[PDB]
Each structure stands twice: as structure tokens, then as C-alpha cells.
Amino acid sequence: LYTPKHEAGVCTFYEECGKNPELSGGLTSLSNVSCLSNTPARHVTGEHLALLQRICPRLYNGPNTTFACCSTKQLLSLESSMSITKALLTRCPACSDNFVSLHCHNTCSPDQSLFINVTRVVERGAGEPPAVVAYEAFYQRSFAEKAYESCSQVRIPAAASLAVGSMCGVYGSALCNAQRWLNFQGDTGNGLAPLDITFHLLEPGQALPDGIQPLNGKIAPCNESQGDDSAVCSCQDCAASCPVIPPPEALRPSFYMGRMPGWLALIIIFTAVFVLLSAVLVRLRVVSNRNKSPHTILGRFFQNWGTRVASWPLTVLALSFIVVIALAAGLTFIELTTDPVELWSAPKSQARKEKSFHDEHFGPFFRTNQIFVTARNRSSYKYDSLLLGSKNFSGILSLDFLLELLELQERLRHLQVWSPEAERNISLQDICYAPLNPYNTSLSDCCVNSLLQYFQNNRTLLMLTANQTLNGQTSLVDWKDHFLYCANAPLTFKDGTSLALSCMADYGAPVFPFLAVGGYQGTDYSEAEALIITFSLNNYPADDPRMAQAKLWEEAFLKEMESFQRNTSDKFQVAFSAERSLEDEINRTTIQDLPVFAVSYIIVFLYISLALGSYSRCSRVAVESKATLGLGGVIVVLGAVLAAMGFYSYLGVPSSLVIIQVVPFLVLAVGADNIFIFVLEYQRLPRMPGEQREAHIGRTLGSVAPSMLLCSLSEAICFFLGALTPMPAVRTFALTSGLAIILDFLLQMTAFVALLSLDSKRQEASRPDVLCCKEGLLLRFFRKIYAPFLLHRFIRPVVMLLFLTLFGANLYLMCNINVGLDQELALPKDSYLIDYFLFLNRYLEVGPPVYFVTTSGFNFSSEAGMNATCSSAGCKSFSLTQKIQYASEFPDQSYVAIAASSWVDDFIDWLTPSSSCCRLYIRGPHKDEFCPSTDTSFNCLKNCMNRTLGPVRPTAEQFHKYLPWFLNDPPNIRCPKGGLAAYRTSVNLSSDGQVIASQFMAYHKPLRNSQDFTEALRASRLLAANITADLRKVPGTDPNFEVFPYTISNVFYQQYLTVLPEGIFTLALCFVPTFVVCYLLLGLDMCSGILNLLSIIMILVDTIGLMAVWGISYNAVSLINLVTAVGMSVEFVSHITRSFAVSTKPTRLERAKDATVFMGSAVFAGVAMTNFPGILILGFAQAQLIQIFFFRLNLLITLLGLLHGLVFLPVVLSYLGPDVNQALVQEEKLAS
Template identity: 35%
Template sequence: MKKLYSITLMFVIWCSFTISTSFADYIHQEGYCVMHGHCGSKSFFGKELNCPHNKPAIEPDYDLRSKLVQICGSQYENSLTCCDANQLDDLNSSTKQVETLISTCPACWKNFLNFFCTLACSPNQSTFLNITSIGTSPITNLKIVTSVDFFVGETLGKGFYDSCKDIKFAATNGYVMDFIGGGAKNYHDMLAFLGQERPIGSPFQIDFPLNDTSDIMLPYDDPPKRCNDIDVKYRCSCVDCQSVCPVLEPTPEEKPPCLVGSLTCWAFGLYLTYFILLMAIVIRLFVEKFWNRNRFDREGFEPVALTEEEDTSLTQEHPSRRYALNLLLQDYFYQQGYMCAKYPWQTIGVAALIVFLATLGCSQFEVERDPVRLWVAPNSDSAMQKEFFDQNFGPFYRTQQIFISNINSGLSIINYNTIKKLFIIEREIRELKSFPDNHTLQDLCFRPNGDSCIVQSVTGYWQSDLDRFSKETWEEEFKSCTFAPTYCLPDFQQPLKPDMILGGFENEDYINAKALVLTYVLRNSLNQNEIDAAREWEKSLREYLDKLIGGENDKIDVSQLRITFSTESSLEAELNKSTNTDIYTIILSYLVMFFYASLALGNATLFPRTIIDSKFMLGISGIIIVLASVSTAVGIFSLLGIKVTLIIAEVIPFLVLAVGVDNIFILNHEFERLTLKSFGEVSVEERIAKTLGRMGPSILLSALSETIAFGLGGIVTMPAVRNFALYASLAVWVDFSLQVTAFVAFLSLDAKRQEEDRIDCFPCYRIERAPERIDKEGLLQKCMRKYYAPFVLNKKVRIVIVICFVGVFMTSLSFVPQVELGLDQRIALPFDSYLVDYFNDLDAYFRIGPPVYFVTKDFNVTKVDGQKSLCGRFSTCNQLSLANILEQERKRSNVSYIAEPTSVWIDDFFHWLNPSLEMCCRFKKGTDQKELCDEYDDDNDCEICFKDREPQWNITMSGMPQGEEFLKYLGLWLKSSPDESCPLAGKAAYGDAIVRDLEDITVKTSHFRTFHTPLKSQNDYIAAYHSAHRISELINEENPSIQVFPYSVFYIFFEQYEYIISLAAEIFFLAFVSIWFVTTLLLGSAWTGFIVVCHVIMIITNVLGIMALWGVSLNAISLVNLVICVGIGVEFCVHIARAFIVGGEGVDREERAYRSIVDVGSSVLSGITLTKFWGILVLAFTRSKIFEVYYFRMYVSMVISGAFHGLLLLPIILSLIGGEGVGSGEDFDYDVFEDEEMFGGRPIRSADNRMLVDDGGIESGESDAEEL
């Protein structure tokens, strides 16, 4: 390939210069030459150099003129010349090879040809060429030119460069300028590259002075052809010329965001709304206060205190209605509670049997670890597209990557010793054998062209051969190769761009790069045996690098180097290790919650009464019920073939514990209250029955709401979320069923044990002379009654609290759009994982984005209409063809995330057929056009494809093959290997990019490869995914005959973010509707059900706002946690709401709100808030970042938000606008405060409660408490 890449530099050998050391010594005027013919070479193996010849131009004979016109054009039909036949032969041979690269853009080709024809043959050569040095050929003893100055005008130079700079070399997703100009960024660099003397470049030095200070030389400055030339025969296609491309519509990403100052319009609107509401409330309060004061003054009335009876008659609501369903549920749970308490062992036995039978399904237990099956539904677009791609083109390669930098990150890594160490490391990796099957890199690597593995490393500039790496010349060679990678090809014969092998440099200052990048590419396969072999070698590679970094390699000292790495299987291995580490944190968290719950259920008394009144065993039984509900759900769904995920294993016990412990506390506290009132008068069975009769409907309400809400989540397609929703729904319902049966039985047994003075946990032992049982109100409940409830329900406090909560809600709502999407891989890893450093280096140093393939399927490209929908380099291609759209999108890479030119196989294929490219498509004569010639076959033994074809091959595509002929030539093209003479051959670049269907005479599928820009953040990956799909939709829209979809290896993991917001909205909507329906049905109040739903929405909103502020992104894990938040929110709210609705007959909202706090507030606080709080604290000390971010932060947020809304805001809202109350049966009267010994001999009625919430503030409430 080196010959091809250096061929453009050889044109200078056709030039002859006169010997001159100053302009005045020689003739520099029109009609004079400075060279003519060849006079020998510098060495025996060197190339022919030109003869100095400062004489008039010659008149060519007929044969020479014919050849001159044929090669250089009609401008030489009547002119003199400075070149001979040998020079023209060399010129023709070389330009034919260069034509394969640049003929796709006629303007560039014409300028290129004119430039070198003028250099070699112009009759006015002496006006722009000046010899600066000459030598003597040792072969011929003749004078030869060794260096010249070539004066080129800016108009020509800039126009020449502009016409060629955008021409693509599709096979490498690069530019032709990389080959003909060394990747030049302007015409000065392009010309300097062409003139640089080097062994594989120009045989002598050509300089291009920028300024001519003399009046003798006249720069060559003929008007060049433009790529958008008005002459259509020179006009280039959109792919190679930006000026002729169609203008695409702006994308939404290009539109500026709506801002008011530094605030988004959304946030500004919310804050403005809140300010208006706040001002309206303040104004109303002032007006109301002024009006009331003036009204009394005007009317002359004096407020007189009412008697209790008068006050009650005025403030009492209409007698509470009876709600039949409530009475029915109370009666049902009363009967069930009585039976379970009367026959506890039978109840426990039946429950245990059912749980045991269900748990047998765990024999089919499987954990789903494949991330593809976790996050993507099998019928999703990305999953089907990945399967289609893998089946037709093979799975994407397995990548192993190493970054090497200095311990001191500010120092350059480019030095002789470091690169030498890299040679040794690579050699040892090549010799590395896996255990136990002894696989080597050579066995497993990807080899697109011959036996050479793709290893992208700076050592490739020296063909990975340490003997070529010289201490004296390495730096110059490094600079030369990074400037022109095409001239320093590695053994796998593909250019190594500096961006691929170096990192941490600026402005192409490669010598000061901060990192070396080493990449190995292994084959991938659908065959599990091949995958296992690759994994085995990758494990050996990891072990080798671990020892190298750890200083265990005696051959190489890397103590001053920082090495980070990753293999294809590294992430999965580290994630599994993280899970194994986190299991201990999870277990400890659950144990803390279990221990707290067990202790909190009992009452603190003096020894030895403590060991009797404690309820540790009851707490353990409640925890066993929680575990039994989880195992039941796992057993049933395992039997149904629904696999457990790590999210389920880690989260479901947490959820069920949150729900279950709350219900346990509610039942236990209600039982304790009944015991305080009627101990010694009513049997345990009767008290248990009344307890379940009162609290059973409330527990049913929360359980049914959560079960339905979670169950509806099962309709979503994302497997991780769907499976979680199904498991959670069943586990919560089983937990409820066991609590109202088995736990009631345990509660009955524990109560009887306690009344018989038996020791907790050791019921066989009874304390004979135990102290008398002290029945008193619990401390938490007392605080709720005496201090918390009066304070919260004070009128002024209520106003302030409502204003604050609305403000917090509005603020949270303003932050919701700022919640980022994605899951950073670093967060999912242990904090000390070696991959964390690797990902940091990847972001800091790697400058190449992942490849992206635009795949066509079910499309007949053998017809001309289909060909026009794909191509980009022919005049009749559709203006918005696939190639043209992708090229235009590349030019706005800030929104398209497309960085490189696209490999368009059909353009290269058709140009390979071009008969003017005589070294490309050639058949061996006598083989019936079935066997191709290679570069070494004699021209006389070959016939050129399409040479005598009718219609002829042309740029309008009228002479292109179709149908069976198309497939015939396509097959030959895909078998031909690229070489110096024809780089357009398709085997290396497109061998696995096209799937032919010979039976149906079509191309079944093909892909068009390009590269994304470097993607650093999750937002970049999501935006790149979105952009690629937007582009494919545009292609399909503009070309209805084709079906295109984009594919990149990471797409399948990011599809969820295309719909995760709508998915979350769908789940929440269904959950909220189901919660409203169930609460309305069981409470008998649609309005109260609406209030509950509003509070759950506010809790979710607050959590989302905290996620935005605390750096918690939205993904499948956080979405599952948000679904949990719905359940936690219901737990915080529905018990308070039901206690408010069923709060006694004929009492106003304020008293029912007061009673709801006192009756169940303490249970909610101790049962769910404090239990979860202690368990969450443990998560703060986890080694896993994912637990710290997605569990600790989110759970803290949801528990705190839920507690504040359920225990603070909800009672206030209910006291202000709560729904109408309903009465309970006579056996379930909620007025438990009528006990004269406890509460001063009178019940708390409306008049008392009014005093608690009047304008007098907390003082009046406290005095009332003292009076009681």
C-alpha cells in the first residue's frame, strides 16, 4: 500500500530544472524550460531524477502531442512542451493510480492533473520554477535536480486545496486529503507535504515559497476548477463538496432554549404562579382581619362564650352517614380476627402450608443477569435490530483497551524509554496463553486482511518491530508518522490516526501527548464456544496486567507509569463482584430494621416486667411474615418462568418490609389501646377481633391500592420494571393476607403469653410473682396527643405550613426537567474497581467515538431507483439520498453526533467498475469473466470490465449493472483485495457489510458505517442514540423505497431513555388512578381519595426535585424506586385518611384530623418512618456507589418527604377541606378517649378541639392538655 500512498509525491521526477543559484544567472521567461527528460538517480535503487534544461520549449512531434493531449488535455493541442515521451508515460501511469482516489470529484481531478501536467510539461516552466540545488548521478554521471522552488499563486493553491479537501475515502471513513496531502488543513500544508523529500515520498525536495521578493518569477496561478463549478462536468457530488449539498431542516436541538434571565421559562412560570398565590393569601388574610375587626365595631356586638352544649350544636356537622361497604368490611374483619385469635395454631399451620407449597416453586429459581434481557423487551426495536445485525453481519468485535500515562499527569508520555516498554508489553501480550486451553491472541484476533491482527498502537508506526525503533531517529519518525499516518502503515495495513493511539494532546501537538492508547480487537461470535475462548484469554490478559501494575513483572519497570485497562468481559465481572459485596450491606440494613421493629413494638417497663412486656418475638414473627410473602412471590413467579432480577432481590424485601412493618405497628398499637381501655373486661379474642375490625379496612385499603398500582406496572415492556412490578404486587398482597391471618394469630398468642406473665422469646417460663401490669398510654402517642396535634392544627401554623409545602412543591416541580437520564457505568461499580480509573481515562484521553451503522433491509438495490436512494457520488443520485443526508448530518456534528465520513459501499463499488481505472476491475482472459486479475498480472492477459459496454459507464449511472449482473459484479468486488493499484476493492472494507440473496436476486441487507463523535457523558450517549434514529427516520421519509435503522453496540442499553419519561408517566398515571379508585371505593369519599392522590403526587415530585439537586439520574433503577415511592406514599397517607373519614359520628373536620393524628400517627411514625430511617442509615456506608446514589439518597428522600406529607400536611388539608365522615358500627366506636381515669373524666369533643386550633396558638393547646 505504501506505493499508492506515496504516488502523488512522485510527480516531481517528471520535472527538469536548469542549474541556477540565483534568478539572474538563468533565463526565467515565457517559452523557456528548466527541465527536460531524465538524467539518472541518486543511487542504484533510487528513482529517476530530471535533467536541468534552461532552454526554449520544444515543438512535440505528432505522437508526443497526441499523447500529451490525451493525458493533459486540449490546452496542449497547439502549444510547445518541456516534457518528453518517457515523462508522459510515467505521468500517465501514476495519475491512473491517483485517479482511483480523487476521480469521484471531477474538479479536484482536473486541478490535480493540470497542476502536475503544468509542472512537467508547461512551455513556461521557467517563470514559476527555480532550481536551488543540483547533484551528479553516480549511475550516469549526469547532472540531476536535487531541490527546487515552485512558486504557486494563492488563487490556484487555495482553489486546488478546496476542491479536494472534502473528498472522502470511504473504506477507512477518512479523507483523500490524508493520502495526497498528509491530512493538511490548508493549501500551504498540502503543498509542503507533496514537496517533502523522504524515502517513500518525493525523491528530492520541493519548496513552495510563500512570497516572491523578485520581479523575475511569476507564480503559477491559473484559475482552478471549483467543486461547485458552473460547468456540470466538473461539479462534484454532495459527499465530496459541501457547496452543492441540500440544506437540511434545523433540528429541535439547534433551537435556543426558552429562558427568562438565567431561569427556564418553566421555572419562571412556576415561581411567578407561586408568588401570585402567596400575595393573594397575604392580601386575603389582611382583608379578613380588617373586616372582622370593623364588623364587630360597626355592629356593636360583643363575643360571648358558649356553653359546651351550645358550641357543639353549632359546630357539629350533619350526623355522619353510614357507608355500607365500610360496615361490611368491619364486620368481616371482626369475624376473621376472632376466628384467627381463637384458633391461632390452626391459622398459622394453614398459612405455613400455603407458603411452603408456593415456595416449592423456588426450585425453578433463576436470576436474570444479562443486561440486554433486563433493560430491553425482546420485541423492542433495539433488541430486534441487534438480533438482525448479529445474525447477518456478526456480533460487534470484542475490544480490549489499555491506557498508559505518567504518574505525574502533567508530563508527556512520548519518550524513547516508555515506547520501548510498550514494545515489550505488546510482545508479551502476543505471546500470552490462556489457561487452561492455551488460546493466544493470534487465535482470537480480528484479521480483516491476511494474518495480521488489528492492534492499534503507536508501535504500529514501526510495524510493531522493536528492531526498527532506533534511539537516534525515533522522534523524527514519530513526528513524520503522526503528520502522515498513511505513510507509516502497521502490519494490518490500515492507517493509525493519532486520535486512536494518543491522548491528552492539544492542537496536534502529538509529541506532548499525555497518554498512549493500546487497543486489541478480537473476533466476536454467536458460537458460545468461541465466546468462552475469548473470555478465557481476556481473563489471562487481566491477570497479566494486574501483575504488571503490581510490580510482579521483572522484565519491565512500570513504577513511574499509570496503567488502566478494560477487557470486553471486565464490566460484567466487576458488576458481579459488586453485587456479591453489596449483599452484606443489604443484609445488615434489613437486620437493623428487623431489630428496631422488634424492640419498638414493646413497651419500656421496669425489670422484671420488661422481659414479659417486650415483643421481640412478635416482631420476629412479623418479619418472618415479610420473608414468607417474598418467598411466596418468588416461588410462584419462578414456577411461571418469570426470572428474578438483582433489583427484585435487593428492593422487594425493602418494600414489603416498609409496608408490612407499618401494618404490624398499626395492629399492635390499636390492640394496645383497646387493652388499655378494657383490660380484664374483654377477652383477648374479642380485643383482637375489634382491633382487626377497626384497622383491617385501613390495611386493606393500603394493600389493595399498592397491589393494583404495582400490578398495573406489569403492563410495561421493560423486563426489569415489569418483573419488579409483578413481584411487588404479589408480595404486597401475600404480605397483607398473612398479616390479617397469621400475624393476628401471633398477636393473640403473644397477648395471652403476656397476660400469663410468661417471658418473651421463652414462653415456657413464667414469672410467678411478676409486678402488676402497668397500663398506660405510650410516650409517642402521648406526645402526638398533647403537643404535636395541637400545634399542627393551630390556625396560624396551618397557614404557614400550607404555604411552605406549596413553595417546596413548586420548587421541586421547577427542578424536575433538570433530572438527567442515564446510568453512569462508574456508579454501578465498587468505588475501588480498576474500571473506574479506566473510564476516567477513557473520557480524558480517547478522541474517537463508537462506530454506528446505518442498516438497510428488505430493499432491492439491484434496481436503479434503489441505487439512487443510496448513492452520493453520481449526478443522478437523489438529492436527499442516504449518502447525502449522512454527509450533511456530519457537518453539524454538534447535534447529529456524526463525526466521520460514511463508508458508502455502492459508491466505491460503482467506481471500482469505472473502466478508466484500468487497475481495478480486470478479468483474466479466457475465464469467462469469473477470475479477476491482480496487480501483478500482465496487462495483455487481462480485459477491463465495462470497457466496451453499451451504454458506457458514466457519472449519470445510466451504464450501471442491474439485476443478476449487479450481483455478479458485486460478488467479484467483495472478493477483491485492495492494493496499491486499486484501493477501492471491497474485501477488506466491505466483506462483512453486504448480504446477497442470489435466489431472490437482491441484496438482503447491507450497512453503511460511520463514527459518532467522542461521547463523554450519559447525555452524550442518549443524544447520539436519539440523533441516529432521527437521521434514519429522515432517510426513510425522503426515500420511501428503503428501510433504514441505525445500530451501534451501545444502543440497546439506551433505548429505554427514548421512552422512559413517557413510561414513568404511564406507570404513575395508572398508579394514581388505581389509588384514587380504591380509596374512593373503600373510604366512600371521592374527594378524600383525590386528596390522598394529590399528596402522593407531591411526594413523588419532591423526590424528583431532590434527584435533580442530588445528582440522581432517571433510569430503570430509579424508576423502580419511584414506583416504590408510590407505595411508601400510600402507606404514609391512607391510614391517616381513613382514620379521618371513619373518625366518629357527628364531629367536625378539625377534630377528625386531630383524632387521625392521635390514633394512627404514632404508628405511621414509628412503624414506617423510624424503621426505614435506621435501615437507610446503613446504606450510607456501602462500598457501592450505586447503593449510595440510587438507594440511600432516594430512600432518604422518599421517607422524609412521605413523613412530612403524611404526618404534617395531610392532616391540615383534611382539617380544611377533607371529605365527609362516615360512621362506624357500635362495636367500633373510635372515641377511645372517654376513659375517665386517663383523660380527666370527659371526652374530647368539638368544643375542646376548637380551642386547640383557634388563633390563640400553641399556648391554648398546651393549657387544654394540662387541664385534661
């Protein structure tokens, strides 16, 4: 049972006996145990020498000597046994050779007795040698550590982990040293080691037992080539052969313009424009001090128009109603598009072109339905685990919680629905994603990720306990030791803690700890706060019928999860989501709060009716109010709204939630201003003796029509210019609003003028109006209280200083601008998805995957093509997957956390003849056809390719012939690599076997804010451009070959890379024709134009500043609201400014006083008080996009408009206003 003598030249065993009686089980075919024989080494010649030279190249010692101690049977058994490990480690030949060197030194070395002590045997009967079942081996520490370190970084791209992580048992790749690695190699409990070998890594200073000396042989270093191999390992594979480059500085972040922040550019632009305009305006004032009729043209035209309209009022009302009904009739063809991708992004953007390419070539990205579960009040605890130290465990990991979650998951898997179209029950196995067995799938094949997958969703295995004696002490093993083992080493076929439990999921895939649990730091997997249950379903195109079935199943999923959410509030806090939830939640409340909004029309009707009358009695106001004109106003507004929506429905343009819930109420806030001002001016001007009411209304319309035309044109032009946004919802909003404003103006100049004529006709008869069968408080208040106060000599410099202070303060506050909109922001206030997004932001440890997709034009069959893509030994440095690996080493500068997988490296590795993966039938019915790795017959002794002196590279014919076999070969214990699961959907093959498109999957780091999605997009695009530029240098590459980074979030966040240049350019385009129309229409006074433009700039800057303070981010929706501000503020500025300009008072102060009282009262009572019921009613929206971006911004715009129009502007007109237009002075004097 031992080796009595071990001087030199002798070995401890030679012939291979039968099977090992002790283990009895295994994963694969094992290796028979050698029989003990202490005997001098054998003289190895002939074919035995050829076998030795091939199997163990570091034992051949000359042509004619080569003493060794193993038979041909042991050499063949060793060659069979190491095929799996060689299949994993062949990427770095130095590592493969070192591992094989260790095994063939143990098995066949002629100096076997110098380091091996046999300790335990089993007798095989009298006259027979006993078989060896346990022994120990002695090595130097430096030898084993160099051998380990040469293999320490070899990677498994398909699993995105280290190969050493599958070879160190309970210790993962993070905690594995040479001792643990060698202990795993000798541990028979894993189902792989044929016999028990104890490894002593005896140190050199240490004194050793009698004749034993530690082994110290040759170890191939990482970076050193051996002979003429030229197969030096790349540093992705061993981390010792690439030059050191200091970590790259991060790139200039998006939301920065040029070399400076975007807000700094905003301050520079607004300040420069303001100071230039102010300097020019004051220059004109001092020039006027040194110096000590288009209005009539439009007046005459509008008087003729008004008189014709007043002449025939019933006919024009008839045509107005006919046109309004004819346009509104288009609502029968209305179509609503509810998908987020369609509204959020343009159909011909860059991200959508990439999305279309990916979806066409590889299929759409699968639908992910997730559940996050945490523990409400359970405390943590300790567990004295086996093979590890004491481990803290979280409260959520309590066994009863896992049992009820197992009941939940199993209940969800067996959920079935009725399909009205298919006329059958749809179960999970009909629509689920399945990486293994895609066709003829079952429930056991569906992709479902959870912690419970470590126990293959089997209740009996979860509750199992076992007795294990380690270090001489018997203890108890339960599910927690399997959990810790799998969390550290997820690539385990068999656990060693007395339980033969696979660590793989039931559908055949490893479950990585970041996919099962979350809420941890470092490698403290047992402390995880939240558990994650993920269902992945196949996606399809929207038109395809299968999508409806998937949506029905997800609906049942949502109802079941709401049931389990309500049922157990005493144990868990649960967040959950479904793929269709985002589409359902955003569009849920379009209709629900619309009758709540409808009260604004009633409030506007009542305000217009009461404000224009209801006086002198306060008890007969029911008949003295102007009910007819209120009804007219509200009908004109509704007419414009319905006509605009109808016309766009007639052109096939769809509508959305930004149309239904916003457009009638913003148009309500705008449209009634012009008629309120017109009616007030009608009441104020007295009639001349002998004049008819038609001429009076004509003269009134001639008086006020240029300003109403100015406001309508300015707002309509601003909305149409605001339609340049790439976002379709905002584009549709802008076009609908523009058309509604134009049609509103056209109805105001025809139907309302006619209605005022008919109401005046009724008024002259001193009769009650249709429905209800020379002073005023506004003018007295403004004349006696407001105007003596605002224009007082001790007020005007204070108002000037206060408003310039406010402007400067808002320019400062403009620095705090957020760019981008969070997903939560879109949701309704009470949606369950808000909890889901909070749980994702706190508990996931990885982000979404990113696929670097290569288009057609790249020859993957050429050796130059393979070398510019692979990352194994002999591949070119700075290759595609090595660039991705390098980007993955610095996750904060480039938002990639997990290195890419690659079909090329696994294909080349699979083709390797030494890996026993690609075999051909040598004889029989299927001669020269593919022999699967699971065929255990003797018909498959011919490898796919021949042996080589370097890396394995096929020719073009071999590449095209063998690639469809690789892409359909399922992985198993015999061959780990294969493309059925990981790569079948990642390569597109045309019928001549050509590669049309290909993708390389990698994972982002967790992304939480809009800034993280935007920066991840920028860094990922920069990496893909860097890959594309170097791939284009390979000869034969098409000039239109590119690599692009598809991920599902790109179509939502692409727009935030350009939103600032587009927003600034759009605002400047809004400012230019506004100035042009107010300059040209009001009589070509440069002073008045500059005054209006400066006021609009101040209102806009104040709006942006206070927006930044409040916490409203900048995006396309805020942009269209600021465009609305630029348009709308003309209604607060232009009327007062024109009233000042058209005035005959000799001094600036008197003109400021009279313009302030008359038009200030009209502007206040009309514009402000009409704006409030519309805008304020959106504060009950319950959809956060409207509550935040439409209510708050339009409210701020209205208040700043009122503040600037009524307080600032009269004072500025008093100081810096235009001089007197002498043509009206002469007109007043001559006609006097």
C-alpha cells in the first residue's frame, strides 16, 4: 500500500487496472486506476514512443532513450480524460501545455518515485497487484505558482468568465490560488478526478521526508514563444503580454458645447444679444434727444372687411359652421399610436435605422418580464458554512420565503390563457424564449432566471439536507452551502458537498449571481437584499399575430403579480414589470382625466360672460351678462381645435396623448384673448351721430385688427418653427397647434364679428339676449390707482433695477440645467412602474446588453479577416474583441462592465482537432458527414482538421463547410463550446454560406439616470467607430462596412446628444420672423421692434432660469414649451407697445400713462385671466409629463408675461420709447 524505496529511476505504478471501486459515479467516462508496482522504468520504443511524443511533448528525451512509466492504455486514457480542459485552455497554448505537463508528469514521468508517495490501495485478489486509489504528490511552490499564474487569466468568452473559475470548486475565480486549484484537480468528489491525490506544495527552505524531493520542471511563460510556434498568448488571455498604457482621460461629456458647458454658452449668447440691443436702443434715445401710414392702410382695409362682414352676418355664420363641421368630420378616421418607440423617436433616425437592421437580420430583442422581491422586516443572521468561513445572510434568504417564491414562480409557469384568434389555450412553452431546444420545446426549456434555478426549480432538492465529514468533523450541509458554491462558481456540473446537484439551470444554462439576486457589493452574494425573477419571451414584429398571444400572457402575468403583491404585505415588498406595461401605463390616463379638464371651458365661458357685463344691479346679472358672446368665444375655440384635429386626421397623420390632453386647453388659453380685447375696445369707443352699427364695428375692427393679426401670426409661425423637433409626438403637437391658431384667427375675423353685429342688433332693441329668454372698475382702477403708482418718479428706477436684477439672477440660475427625461417622468403619478424603476435603480448589478453589430462587406473567411476579429493566440493585437475587453477594463470612462462574447473565437476553438469537438464518420451509412460530440460509437475517429504547428485556421472552403455545423451543435459535458445556444441567432448566413451580419454581445454597467444612458450611448458609439475605422483597413473590406452598437434604450436617448444645438437654433429661428412681423406690421419703427424683442428675450431667460431652479429638465417637450413662450409673450408685449406708439400725447410719460391705462386694462383682463383657467386646470392631470412640462412651464410663462407686460414694459416705454409719429398728429389736426 506504499512505496518502500524511491531513490531514482523507478516508478510507483505501471499498468492500468480496472475501474475504481470507491467513486462508482461520474459525469462522463472516467479513467481506470493504475496497479501499484515499484519497479525500474521501461524502455519506450516505436509507436509507444510516437504516442509519448504526441501526448506529452515534455518527456521525449532523445531519439533512442526516452524512459517512461506508462503503457499505451494510460496514454490513451489520459488523452481522453483531458479533452474538456484542453478544449477550455487551448486559447493560450502556454497554459494548456503547463496543465498537460502537470498531468503527464504525474502519470508517465520516469522519475515518478521522486515526488509521489502511494498511500492507499485496494487488493484485487491473491496473485494480482492491488490497484492504486489514493496517493500524494510533492511540488515546489514556485513551480506550481508559475503554472497557475500562466493559466490565471484564460477566459471563456461564451460564459464571460475565467476558465480558472470552473476549476477551483467552492472558491471562485476571485479567491483561487495554486493550492486550491491543485486541490480541485485531486478531489474525487467533483465527479471528474479518477482518484484521490493530495498535493503538498512543499516550500524550498522546508525539510522534507527522507528521500522525497519536490518536483520542479519546465514551465512555459506567458509572453515567450517556444521554438517556431509564434503563438504568444495575448494579454486578454494571460495578462502579461501587452504594453502598459495609462488609463484614458474621459471624453468631453455631452451637454457641453465645444470646450465649454452648454449653460455657459447659453449665458454668453443671451447676454451678448441683450447688451447689443440695449446699446442700440439707448443710442436711438440719445440721438432723438439731440434732435430736440401703414396703420391707416390696414385700418382702411379692415374697415371695409368688417363692414362687409357686418352687412351679411347670417350667411358668413352659415359658411363658418359649414367649414367647421366639414373639417371636424375627419375625426371618424382618427388613429392613435400608443407604442413608446413610435412616439418617442422618429421613424428615420439613426437609432431606428440601426434598430431596423438588427431586427431584420437577427430578430427583435426578447421581451423581459421582471419581478424584484425584498423583505419587509426580517433581520439578518450568521451561517457557519462548510469550506468557507462564517457568512452573514440577509433576511430575504430565509427558506420559507424561497419556498413561497417557488410556489409563485411555479404557479406563473403553469399560467394559461385562452386565445380568441388561435382558438386554443396559450401556455408558457408556446411563446417563451429557449436557448436550448428551440423547436419542440417544453416548460423545462423555457428561459426563467431566479435563485431557485440553482436547485433546478425542484422543491425536493431545495429542502434536502446531507451529512458531510470535513477535516475530521461531521457537520450538516443544506441549501445554503449549494447557494454559496453556485454563487462563487456558477459553471459547475456537480457540487462536491455530498449532494450531486447541478449548478446549471434546468434549461441548460449557468445562472450568474447578477441575474438571480441583487443589492450587494463586491462578492458578498449572501448579503443580497433583493431577489430577481425574470421571464424572457420571444419578441416578434408588431404586425405579426404571435405578439398578441405574448401580450395576452403578459396581461395574465400582471394580474397574477398584482394578486401576489396584495396577498403578502406582511413579508415582502414587491416591484414588478412586463414588456407591455410601459405602453399600457403611459396611455392609461388620456381619457380618465379629460372630463376633469373639461371644467376649464365652463370657467372660461362664465368669465367671458360676466366680465363683459353683469353690472349696476348685482341681482339682475343673469340677463345683463354677455352670455351670447361667451358662447360664441367658446364655440370659436372648439371649432378651431376640432377643425385642426380633423384636417390632420384627413391627411393620415396620427394623434397621441400630447394632442388629446393638451391642445384644446392651450388653444383655449390663447384664442379668447383677441376677441376679449376686440369686445372691450368696441365698448370703450363711442359711436358718432348718425352712424350705423355696421360702420361702427368696421371702424373698431380697423382699430384693433393689426394687433390681433400680429399675435396670431407670431404664435402660428413660432409653433410651425417649433415643429422641427425630431420627436413625432412634439412634431404632431406643433403642427396641430399651428393650424388651430390659424383657423382660430380666421373664425375670429368672420363668425365672431358677425355674432357681435347680431348681439348689437339685439342690444339696440333693449331686449334680453337669445339664451336668457360709460365707466368701469377696470378703467377707474388703472386710471386712479395703478398708473399714478407705477409711473411715479420714485417707482420707475426701482422697477428698472428690480427687473434687471431678476434677469441677471436668472442668467446665473440657468447653470443648473438637467438634460434628458427619466423613464419615471413619463409615467402617471400612481403607476406601479415607479416602484419598479426604483427597485431597478437600487438592485440590479448589470445594465442592458449592447450588441456591436457588423454589417455586410467583411470577409470572415480570409485569414486576415479572422485575425482582425479573434482574440486567441496568434490573433492581431487591438482586435475587435480586444478593443471591447480594453473598454471593459475601465467601466467608468466607457460604460461597459462585461467583456464581449465572440462567435469567431469559439468557432476557431471548436474546430481544434485536439479538443475532440468536430468529428467525422470514418465509415458506414453517413460517411464524411458530421459526427456529433455526443456519439459514443467507434465510427468517429477522424477529426475535422489536421494538426498544426501554430493556431488553427481553416481555409475558406473549410470555413463555409463547417460553420453551419458549429452554429447548430448543442453544448454538453464532452464539448463545452458550441453555437446552438450562444451564437445561433448572432450569425446570419446566406444560402451559399456567406456571413451577411454578425453581432458581439456585451453588457453595460448599471444605468440609472438619463445622463447614464446618454453617456453610455456616446462612449459605446465612440468605441464602435474606433472599431469600424480599423476594420476598414483590412483588404477587401467594402467602403460601406460599419459596426454599430444596438441596445433597446438608444431610440429613447439618442435625441439628448443634439437637443441643445437644435434648441438654440430653433429659438433663434423663432426670434427672427417675430421681429420681422412686429417691425413691418407696426409701421417700421426700429425702436418699438427692439423694445418688443428685448422684452421677449427677458421673459424667455427668466422662464429658463426658474425652470432650471424648479427641477424641470431640458428636452424636446420643454423646448416646445419655450417656443410656445416666445410666441405667446407677444400677446403681453405687442398690444401695450402699439398703444404707446399710436398716441398723440406730446411726452413719453403721458403716452406711457394713457397706453398703460387703456391697453393695460385690456391686456390684463383679457390675456392673463383667460390664460389661467386653461393652464391651471392641467394641475390635476395625474400624468407627470403634463403636470411637470406643460402645467408648470405655461404657468411660469403666464406669470412672467404678466409681470413683464404690465410692470416692466410701461416704465421702459416711458424712458426709452419711440418719438411721436407726426403723420397721426397731422391727421388729428387736419381732421379736427
